[PDB]
Ligand binder design. Structure first.
Ligand SMILES: [Mg+2]
Ligand SMILES: [Mg+2]
Ligand SMILES: [Mg+2]
Ligand SMILES: [Mg+2]
Ligand SMILES: [Mg+2]
Ligand SMILES: [Mg+2]
Ligand SMILES: [Mg+2]
Lengths: 231, 195, 243, 250, 241, 204, 226, 244, 196
């Protein structure tokens, strides 16, 4: 209140309000789901249009052949952070001939976000990200908040009404973790999980965005007629 | 480029400059005008390294034109020549110096006097009744030392200049393709169109 | 007033309120501890299981610096990571110029001076972590604890976070009951117990125990994570004592 | 970090006042009294050594300072501000004059340089004005003996005699009665001691008074012989004993 | 009221942030004292280890700045260590540039100048510490010079700092009024330390065990701190006379 | 190619009884070619005189620079600069270009307005001061000038006698140097009158 | 140039010749090569004369400010350390070769310094083109526990060796004696063994000998009133 | 962070005025009055020192009148220390111009430069403006004798007669009444002193409270002389004009 | 120049000649080439005197500041600081330094840092222009764990020969002994070592 004018000010209970307000922008964002088995990892995202004349805003961004993410919140901030990830994935390949571990990508994002929370003049990032990848230790899913907290998960959801999808995945945990060698079944569980967060509208052919990465599967994004199969 | 001469007579300054431009083996042009008008009563001729000559001259011209507009006033020939000298003196200790020699002929409207300044690429300035750069002086100064009078008319100045150019065309090994001659007096700057 | 709106401003009683507010963020974090044993140090931390969907064993919190130093912290996790990144740079530059790995007291001051620097200006915010760290150098084992003010001292045992009061009292008993000292293996067992005891102040959720150690005899003076059988044995010993 | 205070902390108020300068002058007003008197053949500057505790060795705290061999300074106000200004003044006498002309600056121009430093603390970004007024006494060949006052604003004025700090209004009236253009240096010292006694409460002796003169060249303080033109510094600090001798003749 | 938050003048010509930095100087609740012998300079400070989980060997407010210079600090430890690191850097640099050991009084002046800057520049806060520097200087002999958050410094015959500085100060003043000399007329530093501890006991009206004190001694060409056992031997000699 | 002998020229200064003299030739050339016979090398800032030999662009540049500096000196000090003080200023200014120097040989001459003492000094291109009681020489015929001055000079010459001595030193030195001559000027300086004389000499 | 330094009982002495040259030509017959860094720290320089003067003035200026800052008399080791670090940084491009001598509260000192930044300690030193001639004398007559009078004698004899035997050296001997607990005494032209003999003839001219084209009064006065 | 303590010295008010410029002008209105009058044969500068003491060393004192070069002088009203910063800058610009062109700087070109420097402090940098107004008296061979003023906004204008500092409204009315175009310098001297005599807040106008200067071509033949009056010379011209 | 450092039972000894030349002229015949960077860490210098004095002064500063913060540095640490300066500035330096020191844990240690800035820990080391002539003698006569008197003789005899054959070496033989007992300085004059 008197302590929310900038990111360089703790409140008397030890809170950082500008960061909490940045977190609030994610909550307004459209829902996106992430989950994985031991062979594949999947992103599902509900895209948002402005009106009937407009396009549906893209939610999923490829970072490398083995890694990518989905966003909820300020889209230009996702572009800045995904660009940074592309560069870091790229640096690892060029200098070390090594694919960047998903866990290491999470650490780098945390540290980049943190600096915008401790100095004058800056602002925190106003976007949340779900990062999937397949590296030398298998399939991975990460959740990023602009507080800088990054967490490794079997499944999760962020954005408006993400709580429904998140509870579903919590019950299904023992089922979907075992969907090995069957990409289509893993995506189904993803589309079913995201359905627990819809109201008023349902999943249409220009509404739905899906991405998958795994054992012998480069990170690829499906939109349009390619998601009709799952509708 | 090659020959540039100047002579200050009673009421005017006359600058003569060669027309040839030579890229090593071929004479690429035979009508080149090696001069820039800095202000209505001030003319600068130039010679030296390719590119740098025209770049320097146009840079000086732009600066004097800027001063003229800012103050609504024409700088004296002495003032313009001091500005030019400073620029060359600064340039000689640069990373890559301007390799450019100039003559500045101006009519001072306040004193009602023609003035001729000779400045080399080092920033060496001198005011003279007549001057030159390069080898031009070696062939012409003995004639000018003999015939020059401070009370000569413009036509007598041109005739003494014709004699200088004739001696150059006789004894100089290079074909400089004649000269363009320009007169600076109380009425401004004009080109003698047959020489 | 208004003295608490800007970092580095002295209040009329000579206090820096922004630093005191940073301490509130620390007190809000999970419990972390350190125990200095006969020839080493043990570190342990409580990791709250917010959900089933957290992959077990996968969100590691204790961090190594160089090869002989362990660091754990409570409060804002990103701030702790920022401090460890700096500590890694300080350790690298020390070893680069002087050859020998950075001694623990020398390393303590490097972190201390850096954290203190963030109390000198209003253009930065203090660190929202308390850090427990240490390891083995040429003069033996060393355990330290560093606060948001930049204040640090050496310790026999240390604790921070939400269950800090409970852990302290447990730590004090060990100091009283063992003037001769604790073995590294005993210290691991004791560390597991103390985190289990301190988890009462955080009982809402379940938790995951994480332990690490550097011991002259047990790890050759290198920082290692306690895993597998030795971890299970410490979990079992802890479960017994809370029953 | 970086100093992010790149804006002025001293600004004009609606009434045309520069508040921070006025407040600096108030800090000077609270300061211990110091004075200076100009004679025909010299200048004297003087102040009280108000010791903070009797365990303090107050000879280690020098309120009257040599700036050049022929120029000295005293102050009223904040001591630490004075100390750093003396460091800067000693340096600028070299960097912006002696290293150029091979001689020490004349009094008025060293005053000018100190004044400029004080002006800039009154306009530059992220700083407060200096909380001191200086009295600077000196000699140079072409201007002779002189005495200047410098204020927190950077303004300076030449004086025949003046006082600054606590008891300055009374001291200035005392000085107006006694000053004339025929005073010899000893007369001015005597008047300085009389003037200074009025503003001093406690002990009044060589150990509690700090007094220096600009007078004749002191070849005995040069440190070497053999260069005729070098005749020694004109600045000299009087000893404890030298002050007490003149306090019997009081 | 922003003249209270940064180091600009208040309408009475005061710097409140400096005044409040002086108040932070007593937050540790520790008193220190320094005296001069014929050949030495002794500094003592109370030591309080209120937590049993602390390693008491790491708890200290006395610093070895150079071979010849010691420093005791009154104030919180982060600012104390900030000042200690800087003083160490300055002393080492001085020796490199000018070819001789930095004198105690010159280091004090330098640290006092740095402190003055924090009182004039807005972006920097004052350090909440008082610094007492001691040595046996090669030109000036036994030396005590003390710096504060105002950028003030001066040399002392003897001095005291902390919450109860006045009691210690007056006790010391009374002794020197009697003896009429600027120092403790004693050959050995052991006896000068015993004098220092004795007069702190009188002035504070409290007794000390070996773990309640911290002692630093400066002699010709070195400054050193005493161990608990060297201090015990001091305490024993005090009690036996 | 050697910058200090492209343009040619000389300067000499002498002390006498309550007077000083400073003189120079008037030539400016481009090696073998004579360009100007009116290139004066002596300048004055108040009552202090400065002669400069060497590269002509630097001669002109330094005069403009010392006019600049002595004008500011006067505005601030409220008095004209003295010879001793100006000498230090020339030295300081030249040494600031230690590793990219002005190719010159300056000479200072004047009388201190307070002491009345005659003063002269010379410098190398990098600022080293030569303060001579007797005479100072500079230029492309400096060897010749040293020879003339060493034998013609005697101390305490009256102004009218000093004029003849310095004029003959310059003239005969210049006539043994290809790059010097084409005219000459002599300044006779007393505490409150300065006379300037153009000499008649051979024009080859 | 010939320059020497000699330690004695209670202090140190330095000396130098008084000739400065421009190749083979003598520019100044009575040069002053003994410079003051501070009242009791003097130095003598060989090499590039502008550099020896300049580096001496600069360190002397900084030494004076240091002395004021520390309230202590300047030390020779300070002048030495400041000189060598300045010269080292310029990698020999500042052609200053010096002998530095002085007294301070710590005692009496004698050092030499080379243009690249190296320094040396000694009881007797010599620098310049006449250094080998001077050192031959010093190696022949130096002994431990010299008196002030013996050291002045030895130093000036060493300079004389350079004067008579080295073409780069000549004219007079300058000396400066720095004794502990005393003012430094600078003895300019301590020896004068090279006065020019009277010439055979006077070369004063008859007045009117020189041909004149023009006379004119030069206005050295400022713009006049009224 | 630091924003909290920023006064924002370079912002418009809602009426389109510059706060700090307006407040600097308020400061200047309490400074001693300075007057410049331009005649056909020269210029007069007259200014009142602020309330003096008997112990002030007057003959070595300067607070109002300063020399910029041999042809141009200024009278100061406002903060003296601020003025000396700008004065030294102007002295340098004049020498830069003389070095570049080998001609003395025309009066207006100097005035414009100083005024542009003042303007900059009102538009960028976040610093307080200079609390100074100048009267420039000078001569060049283009426009001859010229008078200008500049103020903290960096605005400048030319005048036949002008005042700055205290009581300019009263002073300007008095000048406008008695000024005539064909007036000479000796007449202008009298007008200037008479005007100060009437507008002063002091009891009487005496020599020790004045600074005085003339710029005349009363230097022999086609050349200009500046005269900063000594205390005795101010005393004489007070008697001669019949004010004391 | 002839310099060497030798480890033995009780610690380490440094040795050097005292000649510095400018071409064929002996600019100083009583030079001290054994320089102290810490109480019991000394070095022998060879190459550019300006470079090695500058380097040693910087190292002494680094170790003074190290000591103030972290206590007594090891001989290895001192060698590392020398190396860092010699390696990173190899284009602009001509320095060949031997570092020798005594610890109570490690006892006597010797490191040599030749021209390129490499470091080599050795039982003993030789360097300078005169060392070339005693590679054979030193390799045949060095033993580990010699006594103090034996080690002094070994260095004295070794540098005796280096001085004999190398015109750039000569004067007195200086030595510095580093043990637990302290720091001892020795000097040996020509009339002694020439007759060996
Ligand atoms: Mg030319
Ligand atoms: Mg501050
Ligand atoms: Mg000739
Ligand atoms: Mg010819
Ligand atoms: Mg000729
Ligand atoms: Mg080199
Ligand atoms: Mg040999």
């Amino acid at each position: 209140n008197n302590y929310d004018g900038d990111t360089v000010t703790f409140s008397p209970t030890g809170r950082l309000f500008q960061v909490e307000y940045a977190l609030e922008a994610i909550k307004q964002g459209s829902v996106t789901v992430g989950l994985r088995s031991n062979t594949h990892a999947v992103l599902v995202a509900l895209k948002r249009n402005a009106d009937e004349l407009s396009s549906y805003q893209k939610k999923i961004i490829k970072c490398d052949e083995h890694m990518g993410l989905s966003l909820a919140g300020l889209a230009p901030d996702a572009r800045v952070l995904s660009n940074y990830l592309r560069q870091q994935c790229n640096y690892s390949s060029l200098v070390f001939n090594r694919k960047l571990a998903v866990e290491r990508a999470g650490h780098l994002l945390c540290d980049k976000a943190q600096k915008n929370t401790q100095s004058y003049g800056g602002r925190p990032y106003g976007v949340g990200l779900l990062i999937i990848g397949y590296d030398k230790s298998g399939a991975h899913l990460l959740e990023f908040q602009p507080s800088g907290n990054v967490t490794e998960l079997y499944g999760t959801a962020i954005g408006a009404r993400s709580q429904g999808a998140k509870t579903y995945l919590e019950r299904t945990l023992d089922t979907f973790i075992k969907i090995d060698g069957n990409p289509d079944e893993l995506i189904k569980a993803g589309v079913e999980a995201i359905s627990q967060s819809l109201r008023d509208e349902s999943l249409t052919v220009d509404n739905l965005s899906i991405a998958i990465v795994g054992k012998d599967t480069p990170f690829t994004i499906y939109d349009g007629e390619a998601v009709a199969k799952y509708i | 480029m090659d020959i540039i001469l100047g002579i200050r007579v009673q009421d005017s300054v006359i600058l003569a400059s060669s027309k040839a431009v030579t890229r090593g083996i071929s004479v690429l042009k035979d009508s080149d005008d090696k001069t820039r008008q800095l202000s209505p009563h001030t003319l600068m001729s130039f010679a030296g390294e390719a590119g740098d000559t025209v770049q320097f001259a146009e840079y000086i011209q732009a600066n004097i034109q800027l001063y003229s507009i800012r103050e609504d006033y024409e700088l004296s020939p002495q003032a313009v020549s001091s500005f030019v000298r400073q620029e060359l003196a600064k340039s000689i200790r640069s990373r890559r110096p301007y390799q450019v020699n100039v003559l500045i002929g101006g009519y001072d409207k306040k004193k009602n006097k023609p003035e001729l300044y000779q400045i080399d690429y080092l920033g060496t300035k001198v005011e003279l009744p007549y001057g030159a750069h390069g080898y031009s002086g070696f062939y012409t100064f003995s004639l000018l030392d003999h015939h020059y009078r401070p009370d000569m008319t413009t036509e007598e100045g041109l005739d003494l200049l014709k004699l200088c150019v004739q001696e150059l065309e006789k004894r100089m090994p290079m074909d400089f393709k004649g000269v363009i001659v320009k007169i600076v007096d109380k009425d401004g700057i004009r080109q003698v169109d047959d020489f | 007033t208004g003295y608490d709106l800007s970092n580095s401003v002295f209040s009329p009683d000579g206090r820096n309120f922004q630093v005191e507010y940073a301490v509130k963020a620390v007190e809000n974090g999970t419990t972390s501890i350190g125990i200095k044993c006969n020839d080493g140090v043990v570190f342990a931390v409580e990791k709250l299981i917010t959900s089933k969907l957290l992959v077990p064993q996968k969100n590691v919190k204790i961090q190594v610096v160089d090869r002989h130093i362990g660091c754990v912290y409570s409060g804002l996790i990103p701030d702790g990571r920022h401090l460890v990144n700096r500590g890694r740079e300080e350790a690298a530059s020390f070893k680069k110029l002087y050859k020998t790995p950075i001694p623990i007291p020398a390393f303590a001051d490097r972190l201390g001076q850096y954290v203190q620097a963030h109390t000198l200006y209003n253009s930065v915010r203090p660190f929202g972590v308390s850090t427990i760290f240490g390891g083995v150098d040429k003069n033996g084992a060393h355990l330290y604890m560093l606060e948001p003010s930049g204040s640090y001292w050496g310790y026999k045992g240390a604790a921070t976070g939400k269950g800090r009061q409970s852990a302290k009292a447990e730590l004090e008993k060990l100091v009283d009951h063992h003037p001769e000292g604790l073995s590294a293996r005993e210290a691991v067992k004791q560390a597991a117990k103390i985190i289990y005891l301190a988890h009462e102040d955080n009982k809402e959720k379940d938790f995951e125990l994480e332990i690490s150690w550097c011991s002259l005899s047990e790890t050759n003076g290198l920082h290692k994570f306690v895993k597998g059988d030795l971890l299970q044995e410490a979990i079992d010993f802890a479960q017994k004592e809370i029953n | 970090m970086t100093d992010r205070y790149s804006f002025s902390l001293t600004t004009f108020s609606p009434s045309g006042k520069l508040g921070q300068i006025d407040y600096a002058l108030t800090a000077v007003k609270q300061g211990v009294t110091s004075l200076g008197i100009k004679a025909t053949n010299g200048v004297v500057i003087a102040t009280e050594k108000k010791s903070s505790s009797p365990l303090a060795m107050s000879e280690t705290l020098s309120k009257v300072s040599l700036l050049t061999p022929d120029i000295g300074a005293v102050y009223s106000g904040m001591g630490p501000d004075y100390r750093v200004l003396v460091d800067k003044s000693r340096k600028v006498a070299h960097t912006s004059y002696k290293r150029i002309y091979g001689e020490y600056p004349p009094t008025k121009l060293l005053v000018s340089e100190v004044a400029k430093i004080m002006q800039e603390a009154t306009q530059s970004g992220g700083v407060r004005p200096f909380g001191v007024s200086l009295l600077i006494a000196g000699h140079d060949e072409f201007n002779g003996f002189s005495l200047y006052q410098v204020d927190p604003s950077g303004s300076y004025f030449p004086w025949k005699a003046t006082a600054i700090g606590k008891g300055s209004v009374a001291a200035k009236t005392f000085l107006e009665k006694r000053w004339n253009d025929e005073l010899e240096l000893e007369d001015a010292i005597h008047i300085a001691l009389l003037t200074l006694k009025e503003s001093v409460e406690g002990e009044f002796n060589g150990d509690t008074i700090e007094l220096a003169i600009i007078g004749d060249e002191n070849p005995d303080l040069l440190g070497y012989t053999g260069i005729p033109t070098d005749k020694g510094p004109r600045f000299r600090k009087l000893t404890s004993q030298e002050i007490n001798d003149r306090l019997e003749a009081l | 009221g922003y003249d209270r938050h940064i180091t600009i003048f208040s309408p009475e010509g005061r710097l409140y942030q400096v005044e409040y930095a002086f108040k932070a100087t007593n937050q540790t609740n520790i008193n220190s004292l320094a005296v001069r012998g014929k050949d030495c300079t002794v500094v003592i400070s109370q030591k309080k280890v209120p937590d049993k989980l602390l390693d008491p060997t790491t708890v200290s407010y006395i610093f070895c700045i150079s071979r010849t210079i010691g420093m005791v600090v009154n104030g919180p430890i982060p600012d104390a260590r900030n000042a200690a690191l800087r003083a160490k850097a300055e002393a080492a640099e001085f020796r490199y540039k000018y070819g001789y050991d930095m004198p105690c009084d010159v280091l004090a002046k330098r640290m006092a100048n740095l402190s003055q800057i924090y009182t004039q520049r807005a972006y920097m806060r004052p350090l909440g510490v008082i610094l007492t520097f001691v040595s046996v200087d090669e030109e000036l002999g036994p030396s005590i010079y003390k710096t504060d958050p105002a950028g003030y410094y001066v040399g002392y015959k003897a001095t005291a700092t902390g919450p109860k500085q006045q009691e210690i100060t007056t006790n010391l003043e009374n002794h020197f009024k009697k003896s009429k000399i600027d120092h403790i007329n004693e050959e050995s530093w052991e006896k000068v330390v015993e004098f220092a501890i004795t007069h702190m006991i009188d002035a504070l009206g409290t007794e000390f065990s070996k773990n309640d004190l911290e002692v630093g001694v400066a002699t010709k060409d070195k400054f050193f701190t005493l161990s608990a056992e060297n201090i015990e031997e001091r305490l024993v000699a005090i009690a036996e006379q | 190619s050697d910058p200090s002998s492209i343009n040619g020229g000389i300067v000499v200064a002498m002390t006498g009884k309550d007077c000083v003299a400073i003189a120079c030739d008037l030539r400016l050339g481009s090696q073998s070619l004579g360009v100007s016979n009116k290139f004066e090398k002596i300048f004055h800032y108040g009552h202090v005189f400065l002669g400069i030999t060497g590269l002509a662009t630097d001669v002109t540049t330094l005069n403009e620079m010392f006019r600049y500096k002595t004008n500011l000196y006067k505005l601030k000090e409220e008095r004209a600069i003295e010879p001793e003080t100006f000498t230090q200023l020339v030295s300081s200014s030249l040494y600031e270009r230690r590793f990219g120097p002005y190719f010159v040989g300056p000479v200072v001459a004047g009388i201190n307005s307070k002491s009345g003492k005659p003063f002269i000094a010379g410098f190398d291109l990098i600022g080293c001061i030569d303060e001579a009681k007797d005479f100072i020489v500079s230029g492309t015929a400096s060897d010749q000038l040293f020879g003339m001055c060493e034998s013609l000079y005697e101390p305490n010459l009256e102004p009218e006698d000093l004029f003849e001595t310095i004029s003959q030193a310059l003239l005969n030195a210049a006539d043994r140097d290809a790059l010097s001559g084409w005219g000459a000027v002599v300044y006779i300086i007393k505490k409150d009158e300065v006379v300037k004389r153009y000499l008649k000499m051979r024009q080859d | 140039t010939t320059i020497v330094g000699v330690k004695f009982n209670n202090g140190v002495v330095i000396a130098a010749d008084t000739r400065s040259t421009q190749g083979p030509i003598v520019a100044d017959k009575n040069c002053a090569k003994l410079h003051r860094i501070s009242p009791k720290i003097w130095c003598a320089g060989a090499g590039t004369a502008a550099d020896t003067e300049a580096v001496t003035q600069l360190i002397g200026s900084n030494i004076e400010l240091h002395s004021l800052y520390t309230s202590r008399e300047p030390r020779v080791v300070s002048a030495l350390q400041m000189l060598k670090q300045h010269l080292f940084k310029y990698q020999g491009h500042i052609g200053a070769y010096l002998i530095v001598a002085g007294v301070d509260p710590t005692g009496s000192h004698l050092f030499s310094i080379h243009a690249h930044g190296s320094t040396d300690v000694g009881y007797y030193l010599s620098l310049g083109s006449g250094s080998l001639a001077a050192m031959a004398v010093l190696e022949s007559h130096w002994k431990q526990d010299l008196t002030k009078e013996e050291a002045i004698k030895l130093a000036s004899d060493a300079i004389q060796a350079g004067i008579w035997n080295d073409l780069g050296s000549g004219s007079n001997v300058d000396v400066c004696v720095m004794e502990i607990g005393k003012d430094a005494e600078y003895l300019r032209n301590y020896l004068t063994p090279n006065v020019r003999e009277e010439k055979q003839k006077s070369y004063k001219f008859p007045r009117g000998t020189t041909a004149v084209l023009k006379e004119s009064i030069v206005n050295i006065c400022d713009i006049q009133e009224e | 962070g630091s924003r909290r303590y920023d006064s924002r010295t370079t912002i418009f008010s809602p009426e389109g005025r510059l706060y700090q410029v307006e407040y600097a002008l308020e400061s200047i209105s309490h400074a001693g009055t300075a007057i410049g009058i331009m005649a056909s044969d020269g210029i007069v500068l007259a200014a009142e020192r602020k309330v003096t003491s008997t112990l002030l060393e007057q003959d070595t004192s300067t607070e109002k009148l300063y020399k910029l070069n041999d042809k141009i002088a200024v009278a100061v009203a406002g903060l003296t220390a601020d003025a000396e910063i700008l004065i030294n800058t102007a002295r340098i610009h004049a020498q830069n111009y003389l070095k570049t062109y080998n001609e003395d700087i025309p009066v207006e070109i100097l005035v414009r430069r100083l005024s542009d420097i003042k303007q900059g402090y009102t538009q960028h940098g976040g610093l307080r403006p200079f609390g100074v107004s100048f009267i420039y008296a000078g001569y060049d061979d283009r426009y001859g004798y010229q008078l200008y003023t500049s103020n903290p906004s960096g605005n400048y204008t030319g005048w036949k007669a002008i005042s700055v500092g205290a009581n300019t409204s009263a002073a300007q009315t008095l000048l406008q009444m008695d000024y005539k175009d064909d007036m000479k310098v000796d007449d202008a001297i009298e007008l200037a002193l008479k005007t100060l005599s009437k507008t002063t807040d002091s009891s009487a106008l005496t020599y020790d409270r004045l600074e005085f200067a003339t710029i005349r071509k009363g230097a022999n033949d086609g050349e200009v002389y500046q005269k900063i009056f000594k205390p005795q010379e101010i005393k004489d011209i007070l008697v001669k004009t019949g004010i004391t | 120049t002839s310099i060497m450092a030798v480890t033995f039972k009780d610690g380490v000894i440094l040795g050097a000649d005292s000649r510095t030349t400018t071409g064929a002229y002996i600019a100083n015949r009583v030079t001290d080439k054994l320089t102290r960077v810490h109480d019991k860490i000394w070095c022998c210098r060879s190459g550019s005197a300006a470079d090695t004095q500058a380097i040693a002064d910087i190292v002494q500063y680094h170790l003074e500041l190290y000591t103030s913060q972290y206590g007594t540095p090891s001989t290895e640490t001192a060698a590392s600081v020398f190396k860092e300066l010699c390696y990173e500035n190899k284009d602009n330096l001509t320095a060949g330094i031997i570092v020798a020191g005594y610890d109570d844990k490690n006892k006597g240690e010797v490191y040599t840092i030749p021209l390129g800035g490499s470091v080599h820990k050795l039982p003993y080391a030789i360097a300078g222009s005169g060392s070339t002539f005693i590679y054979g003698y030193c390799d045949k006569n060095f033993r580990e764990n010699m006594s103090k008197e034996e080690t002094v003789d070994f260095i004295k005899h070794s540098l005796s020969q280096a001085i004999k054959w190398d015109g750039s070496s000569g004067g007195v033989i200086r030595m510095v002994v580093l043990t637990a007992a302290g720091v001892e300085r020795l000097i040996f004059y020509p009339d002694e070592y020439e007759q060996l």
